Amino acid sequence: AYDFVSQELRAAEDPEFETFYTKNILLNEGIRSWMAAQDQPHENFIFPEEVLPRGNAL
Amino acid sequence: EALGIDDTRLIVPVILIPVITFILYAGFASEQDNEDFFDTYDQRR
Amino acid sequence: QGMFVMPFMARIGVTDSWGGWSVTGESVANPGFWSFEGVALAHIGLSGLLFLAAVWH
Amino acid sequence: ITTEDIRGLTYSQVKGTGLANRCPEVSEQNAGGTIKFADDKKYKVTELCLEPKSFQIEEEFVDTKLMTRATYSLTGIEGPIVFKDGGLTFLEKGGIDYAATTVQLPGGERVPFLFTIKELEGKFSSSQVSAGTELGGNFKTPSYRTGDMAVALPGLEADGGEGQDELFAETNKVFQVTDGSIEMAFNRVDGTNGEFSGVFVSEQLSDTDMGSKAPKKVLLKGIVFGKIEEQ
Amino acid sequence: MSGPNPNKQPVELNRTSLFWGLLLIFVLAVLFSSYFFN
Amino acid sequence: TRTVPLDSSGTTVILTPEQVKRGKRLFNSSCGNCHVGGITKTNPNLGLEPDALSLATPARDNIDALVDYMKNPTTYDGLESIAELHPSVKSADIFPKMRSLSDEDLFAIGGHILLQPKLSSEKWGGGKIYY
Amino acid sequence: DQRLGANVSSAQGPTGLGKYLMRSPSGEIILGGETQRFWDLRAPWIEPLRGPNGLDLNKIKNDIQPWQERRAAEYMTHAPLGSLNSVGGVATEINSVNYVSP
Amino acid sequence: SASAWERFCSWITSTDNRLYIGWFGVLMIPTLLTATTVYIIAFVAAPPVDIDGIREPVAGSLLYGNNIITGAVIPSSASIGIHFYPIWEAASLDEWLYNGGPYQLIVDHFLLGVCGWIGREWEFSYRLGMRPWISVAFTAPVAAASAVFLVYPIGQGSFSDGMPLGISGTFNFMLVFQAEHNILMHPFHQLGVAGVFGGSLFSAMHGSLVTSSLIRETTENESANYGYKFGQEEETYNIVAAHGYFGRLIFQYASFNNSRALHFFLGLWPVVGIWFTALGVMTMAFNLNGFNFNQSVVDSQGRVINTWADILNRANLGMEVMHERNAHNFPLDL
Amino acid sequence: NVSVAAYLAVLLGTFIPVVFLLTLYIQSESRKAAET
Amino acid sequence: NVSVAAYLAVLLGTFIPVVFLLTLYIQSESRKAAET
Amino acid sequence: METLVYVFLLAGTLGVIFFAVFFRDPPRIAKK
Amino acid sequence: MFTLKIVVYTTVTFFVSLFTFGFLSNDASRNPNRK
Amino acid sequence: NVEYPNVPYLGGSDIIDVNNANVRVYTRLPGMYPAIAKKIIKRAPYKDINEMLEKGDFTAAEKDILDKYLPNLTALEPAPEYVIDNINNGLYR
Ligand code: CLA
Ligand code: CLA
Ligand SMILES: CCCCCCCCCCCCCCCC(=O)OC[C@H](CO[C@@H]1O[C@H](CS(=O)(=O)O)[C@@H](O)[C@H](O)[C@H]1O)OC(=O)CCCCCCCCCCCCCCC
Ligand code: OEX
Numbered sequence A: 001a002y003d004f005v006s007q008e009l010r011a012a013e014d015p016e017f018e019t020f021y022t023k024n025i026l027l028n029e030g031i032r033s034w035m036a037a038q039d040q041p042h043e044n045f046i047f048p049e050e051v052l053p054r055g056n057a058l
Numbered sequence B: 001e002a003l004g005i006d007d008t009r010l011i012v013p014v015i016l017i018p019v020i021t022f023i024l025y026a027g028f029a030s031e032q033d034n035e036d037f038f039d040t041y042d043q044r045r
Numbered sequence C: 001q002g003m004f005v006m007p008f009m010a011r012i013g014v015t016d017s018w019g020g021w022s023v024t025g026e027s028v029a030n031p032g033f034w035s036f037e038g039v040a041l042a043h044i045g046l047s048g049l050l051f052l053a054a055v056w057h
Numbered sequence D: 001i002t003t004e005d006i007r008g009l010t011y012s013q014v015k016g017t018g019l020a021n022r023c024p025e026v027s028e029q030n031a032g033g034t035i036k037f038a039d040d041k042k043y044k045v046t047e048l049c050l051e052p053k054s055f056q057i058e059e060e061f062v063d064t065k066l067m068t069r070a071t072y073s074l075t076g077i078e079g080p081i082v083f084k085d086g087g088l089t090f091l092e093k094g095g096i097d098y099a100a101t102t103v104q105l106p107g108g109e110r111v112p113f114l115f116t117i118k119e120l121e122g123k124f125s126s127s128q129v130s131a132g133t134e135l136g137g138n139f140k141t142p143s144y145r146t147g148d149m150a151v152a153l154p155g156l157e158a159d160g161g162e163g164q165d166e167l168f169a170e171t172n173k174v175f176q177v178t179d180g181s182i183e184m185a186f187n188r189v190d191g192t193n194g195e196f197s198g199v200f201v202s203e204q205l206s207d208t209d210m211g212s213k214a215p216k217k218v219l220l221k222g223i224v225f226g227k228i229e230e231q
Numbered sequence E: 001m002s003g004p005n006p007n008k009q010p011v012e013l014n015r016t017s018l019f020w021g022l023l024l025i026f027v028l029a030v031l032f033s034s035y036f037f038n
Numbered sequence F: 001t002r003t004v005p006l007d008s009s010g011t012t013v014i015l016t017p018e019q020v021k022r023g024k025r026l027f028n029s030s031c032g033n034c035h036v037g038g039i040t041k042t043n044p045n046l047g048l049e050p051d052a053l054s055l056a057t058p059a060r061d062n063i064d065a066l067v068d069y070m071k072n073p074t075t076y077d078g079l080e081s082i083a084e085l086h087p088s089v090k091s092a093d094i095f096p097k098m099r100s101l102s103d104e105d106l107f108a109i110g111g112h113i114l115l116q117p118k119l120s121s122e123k124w125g126g127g128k129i130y131y
Numbered sequence G: 001d002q003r004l005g006a007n008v009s010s011a012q013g014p015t016g017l018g019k020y021l022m023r024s025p026s027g028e029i030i031l032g033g034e035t036q037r038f039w040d041l042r043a044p045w046i047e048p049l050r051g052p053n054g055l056d057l058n059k060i061k062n063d064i065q066p067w068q069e070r071r072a073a074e075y076m077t078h079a080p081l082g083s084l085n086s087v088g089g090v091a092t093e094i095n096s097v098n099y100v101s102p
Numbered sequence H: 001s002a003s004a005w006e007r008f009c010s011w012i013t014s015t016d017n018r019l020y021i022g023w024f025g026v027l028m029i030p031t032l033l034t035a036t037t038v039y040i041i042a043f044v045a046a047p048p049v050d051i052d053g054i055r056e057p058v059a060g061s062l063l064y065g066n067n068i069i070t071g072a073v074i075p076s077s078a079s080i081g082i083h084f085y086p087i088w089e090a091a092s093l094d095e096w097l098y099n100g101g102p103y104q105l106i107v108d109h110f111l112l113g114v115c116g117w118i119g120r121e122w123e124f125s126y127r128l129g130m131r132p133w134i135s136v137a138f139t140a141p142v143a144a145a146s147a148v149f150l151v152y153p154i155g156q157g158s159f160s161d162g163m164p165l166g167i168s169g170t171f172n173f174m175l176v177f178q179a180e181h182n183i184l185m186h187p188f189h190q191l192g193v194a195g196v197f198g199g200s201l202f203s204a205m206h207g208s209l210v211t212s213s214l215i216r217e218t219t220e221n222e223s224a225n226y227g228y229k230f231g232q233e234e235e236t237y238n239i240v241a242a243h244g245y246f247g248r249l250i251f252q253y254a255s256f257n258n259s260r261a262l263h264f265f266l267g268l269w270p271v272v273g274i275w276f277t278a279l280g281v282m283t284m285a286f287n288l289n290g291f292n293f294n295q296s297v298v299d300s301q302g303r304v305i306n307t308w309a310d311i312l313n314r315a316n317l318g319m320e321v322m323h324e325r326n327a328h329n330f331p332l333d334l
Numbered sequence I, J: 001n002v003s004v005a006a007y008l009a010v011l012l013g014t015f016i017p018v019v020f021l022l023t024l025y026i027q028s029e030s031r032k033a034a035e036t
Numbered sequence K: 001m002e003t004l005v006y007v008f009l010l011a012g013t014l015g016v017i018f019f020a021v022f023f024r025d026p027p028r029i030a031k032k
Numbered sequence L: 001m002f003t004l005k006i007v008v009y010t011t012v013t014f015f016v017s018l019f020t021f022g023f024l025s026n027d028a029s030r031n032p033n034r035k
Numbered sequence M: 001n002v003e004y005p006n007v008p009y010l011g012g013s014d015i016i017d018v019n020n021a022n023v024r025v026y027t028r029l030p031g032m033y034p035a036i037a038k039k040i041i042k043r044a045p046y047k048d049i050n051e052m053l054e055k056g057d058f059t060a061a062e063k064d065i066l067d068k069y070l071p072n073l074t075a076l077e078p079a080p081e082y083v084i085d086n087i088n089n090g091l092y093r
């Protein structure tokens, strides 16, 4: 139960539409992207600083 | 701003309502015995 | 638009809404309590009170 | 609520009162003066304050209700007044010259707009500042927000040749610099100092959602104050 | 007072009535489904 | 490693482990609140990464340059001094924590600053990304 | 930024608000950013630089005493953020700063 | 014969009311009803709230594109802070809705109502002639609700940092709290987790021991619950049998011989656990965070060897750099 | 094509009176069985 | 947006077990009433 | 239109709570 | 907004007054072990 | 925006574009920070390099510092999304 499809559709169609669920989705993206490099070292994830999601980045 | 009161009309209920409740409570208390007791609480009502 | 009870609300006075619009097309800055929403909520509260009265009786 | 009334009060009795963003105007006991300009001394305009009233947005022009609290006035705007093309033009370079405020149309919708006079090149009538002179010009309104994926739908970016192109304009956050026009008139001018007071009429555009919604035009009619002194 | 209401009566529905009601409701659904859908 | 450059010509000095430990302790006590992890919490445009120290006028990629910066701190261009804003032995009255640091203390602090780029690379001055 | 060439009063933030100086909900000139919630602060190193409309820009650019600079430079680093094992900074900091505020 | 006030006090403190009112209920009922009314109507139909104060409202009501899970009453604006924001302190009602005033109204009324609920539990314990420490047990969830609704906003200086009145908002509160304070490594939160896990363990254990040793009082064609009659004098289950089973299960004094001591332990373990985790949140409101074991292992040279705390720190950094977008204009989060 | 929410109409209008009749019949049968 | 035929799922899964429980309760109450 | 379903479910839950509180089976002691 | 404020002040004062003068009305006597 | 071709010169490469880059990219070139770059950012829009060398109030020593870094320096068309963030740009590490 990762996502609600209608909420994601409404957030994609309307950039001003935001709920706490979308903020949770962004936090999950942050966890994954900032955690996978050292949490799964066998994959050899090399994420540059520009692909890492940041709140100030957008 | 004392008690968050910025208009003097706000003081009328804040003072007035406790006065009426105290009038009712004072009737109740005047119905009582009102002499000293030697116990943890007063069993007379 | 298929409004059924809105015509009967607008027939005898209730024409404004808390959203700031009127059914005549004008804009209302101060709607007051007796808007469409006010009438609907009054009917809901009246329904609840009558339900409690029915329970008591 | 003049400048003497501003300077007389301390911050303890102005906090939480709303008297700070008032655009202090000159009094009639100090009005009825004039300001002249020499051909050798450089001049600049300081403490240019604007307090907008009666926010109107065309969507006809319908009056709106303010959603923010006391964050809509501009204060302390400074810039040099420079002779150019016969007259002399005011170049805006500093001060609090933007205000991100939201107003509500009487239908439930909110239209945020950025009240600004940034990059103004306004020139005012005649070669003196007195009761009757008007200052007008055009300013450049920056976007409400500043600076490639629909991460919600990984299967939308698989359609083949046409991927996420329906949701492209919302994805393409474009910085758009709209333009606006400001017209202010000076009702009263102080002669002892370089202070002038009056009203202003502004017309600019609202938020574009970085190029995702149509910018509604906003009409702002408030009061204005400013000081002219040495540069 | 709050207790035995003298007007309390039991309610019955024999199997014939049950089958008639089921037939009525199902036949009405069969009849009106084509019109509700279109 | 324990070998850091000393002079600007290319001379290197081998640090004793006691010097390394004392420099680490003094750097965590006197510089940590603003130079945790080799970054600057108060001016993030500059940091203690070796590329920022080497690409400076004068270059701070040696012991003597770091000691001179701790004695007379200048801007990144070098023309303007920041002794009022930056801790220094010149401004020990301004910053009271500098009054206990001697020349050997500055030597140890500079050795610790130079030693860290060779220690857990990409983490010194890389910020919170390399944690 | 006022000393090293950056117009703070006209610098638009990421959301159109003030990045350095913004407007308070009561209409005063306050410090911008996420510190707008702490605009009720009264400190002896900032009250001389504070007019009836909030922070006076002219007094900011003219009437700074150096001891106020020292106080503000000292207070900005030892923020009241710490841990039970006495590690300074936010919870995502390394074990090199030893400070929890009294 | 009695005065009108005496009759009013007899009706208020009456044990014949279907729901006991009491003097604490005089404060409790209107506050809780006000909070419930505002919460219901603001959860169904309330305009989006600029929680961060950056003029980017967040939708939380059902009519603005939310379901039960994503719906919430958004906390108040960061521009407000912990300033008192009733309806009359706003220029208009819609300005009050834009800045999240309903959150403050609901939170204040709910906290007053739950304090009244504590007092009312005491009051009806007193009117019935029983011992009055159920309210002490109820103080723990009240402490936790206060910590997440009032104390954390007080510590952080803004009511926007309180827990949103929703589900996804609650999850967002948990994630941001973990990012900024590392609550998992805080020993008081660990005591709270031990409290809830032990409470579940002991609830299941006591229920299974009582249900296992029920005295045979029913036939095979009926529920075993009817072997107990409401108000009977004898005990419905064999306490000695359950004690013997549990003594032979672990060891002969791992059980409680005394039922009163056993029930004191049952009421003690999770109440103390929730007290400790609520106090941990109260202390992290003032930024006394949990254990920090980042970069605690280095090699002979001094290179950082990561631990599980370092991977946890990476996750906390991932949550930290993404929370409250465009509300941070400065490097540190002080 | 075919209007939606008519599935709800058809199925609920089929179920609810059927539910009512089934409940009535079961109630009556159990009352008869308890009368014995 | 919101997927259709989930109204049917929600409403039928709400109604049918509720129907079952109501029928059970009414049947039991009528058996008790005829036991008297 | 799903908002109507959510409101209906929440109101039904509250009605169940109301009836469970006020129309509960009255507890009485048996004559065992 | 002032009318709502005075209504709320009146209501809060009314209920707090009832609370205060109810707990002053010999509340300790209202127990089943009295007399 | 999604598509912007003129962004290897915002600090991603050797050649640095003025009036579209932050002051942090001048820390790579020694002697170009915090002085000189302030003059570049204050009077931002330039047609080419010589406009920066002429309209900027550069002292002779600053002019020599400019003369040290001709090839890794350019001036392209200004983008208002990067003009507004040439002092802070939100980068802090
Ligand atoms: C305080 C009482 C009150 C008030 C002020 C209202 C007000 C309103 N109701 Mg309402 N309502 C109420 C109670 C009330 N209701 C109650 C208790 C019920 C439950 C039965 C309802 C059920 C209800 C419905 C179902 C509807 C309204 C509607 C309305 C609106 C339109 C009214 C209209 O057109 O009526 C017109 C009324 C009539 C034409 C009735 C006339 C009376 C008959 C003709 C009398 C004839 C017999 C009489 C005994 C003759 C002998 C006496 C004679 C000799 C004088 C209006 C806002 C409508 C609306 O817009 O919905 C929101 C709507 O559809 N109401
Ligand atoms: C398996 C893992 C696990 C477990 C068991 C827990 C367990 C707990 N966590 Mg936790 N957490 C975890 C993982 C875990 N966490 C992770 C991974 C994170 C990081 C994302 C967090 C982050 C986190 C935070 C940030 C917080 C917790 C808190 C808590 C505690 C909750 C206190 C509570 O709700 O009861 C207490 C009871 C209440 C709060 C309810 C109040 C009840 C009021 C008084 C009445 C309500 C009545 C209601 C309105 C009406 C009812 C209906 C009506 C009809 C009757 C609990 C001990 C919280 C805590 O410590 O407590 C402060 C807290 O703030 N956790
Ligand atoms: C470092 C040391 C200093 C600080 C530590 C201080 C120690 C604290 C405990 C000592 C004070 C309390 C004494 C025991 C409590 C009591 O009421 O005695 C009465 C009985 C004790 O035995 C009962 O005692 C009865 C006899 S008598 O009346 O108590 O005399 C007897 O009849 C009965 O059979 C028997 O079961 O109560 C109990 O059965 C509970 C025993 C366990 C309670 C205290 C231990 C702590 C448990 C964990 C705490 C919760 C943490 C949860 C977090 C997730
Ligand atoms: O919002 Mn909730 O947490 Ca009080 O600090 Mn700053 O802000 Mn945000 O970060 Mn950290």
Ligand SMILES: [Cl-]
Binding pocket: G033, G034, G035, H327, H328, H329, H330, H331, H332
């Ligand atoms: Cl910030």
